């Protein structure tokens, strides 16, 4: 949906979710997700955590576990969380490269490559801000329903075929 015929896909209200860009690329990168995190272990920023873990781990005695509890956890977590971190960034990296490839694959729906910028679902994303005002996401689930997910990661509402149906405004169905 890269074409601001209604949304630049990075705008407040009347907006098609960035998920168009992200989630499609995300499914791709996840096929090789482990390699993504691996870049973090060679990343000048994250490596410093490993480096510091050894320093904290060098503490001997019962103070060892006490010291490392706070410190080593953060480092250990840094690399693990980095899978998400670097993946989210990798979304940006792979997406732009895959976008031009997507045209031949008909993968995601785009008006500057494949077909149109927004599908009904993506259109609903735009309408949702007209409906409630919140800049949230919409996705067609397994059953074919358009689930409205808040950026917290939880589906707060659901829209039906009408594309305006919302469990908050005066549109039930």
Automatic annotation (TrEMBL):
Keyword vocabulary terms for this entry: Signal
Origin: domain of life: Bacteria
The protein, known as: Amylase-binding protein AbpA
Lineage: Bacteria, Bacillati, Bacillota, Bacilli, Lactobacillales
Protein's gene: abpA
Range within the parent protein: 25 to 197 of 207
